[PDB]
Amino acid sequence: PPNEIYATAQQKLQDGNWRQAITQLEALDNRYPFGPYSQQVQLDLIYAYYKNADLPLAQAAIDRFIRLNPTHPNIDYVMYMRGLTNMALDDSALQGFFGVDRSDRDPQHARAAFSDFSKLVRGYPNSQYTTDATKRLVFLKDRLAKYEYSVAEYYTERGAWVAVVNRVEGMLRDYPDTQATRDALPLMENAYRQMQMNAQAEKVAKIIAANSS
């Protein structure tokens, strides 16, 4: 009886518990060949997995959904949800360990989330989620920058000045518009100064003296 299980699922999903509000959805999914009447079920399932914090299973289901019907009047919601799933993997908490987060830890989830939100923004700029993605995207470009800044700090503490200058080059070539790059110009100046590269040091000096922070 798909109609009554779907109706009960909607009513106990809107204002009900979510632990067993995916059970009838997955029972409908296993029963059906994923053919007719399953698009709303799949979208409801992705939303339920997200807000139930089932991030890897939601990501697997959304990876499956994108290839089945890459053309859809709600594929923008799908890609936006995929970016949200990666950014929620980026922020481990709830018995997790944090304090400054992926500004100094694994940035692969943030980088995947950035690629996905960039696919939103340059695929469907007229979508009503894109602004949110466009302003999430900025945070991630700051996030991904702070990561390399920590590497540019640690090698500065170590004296690996080739590593410091190459990391700050990575900044200026990939993240030139962010704050963590501005914080990293003094490290490139220092690394050039502990070498006899005083021309490169004064060349970075005018950049850091371009009223930048």
Partner: peptide, 13 residues
């Protein structure tokens, strides 16, 4: 080279 001059002229260190 593990260095480069990204500013202006191409220089290898």
């Amino acid at each position: 080279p593990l260095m480069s001059d990204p500013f202006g002229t191409n220089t290898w260190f």
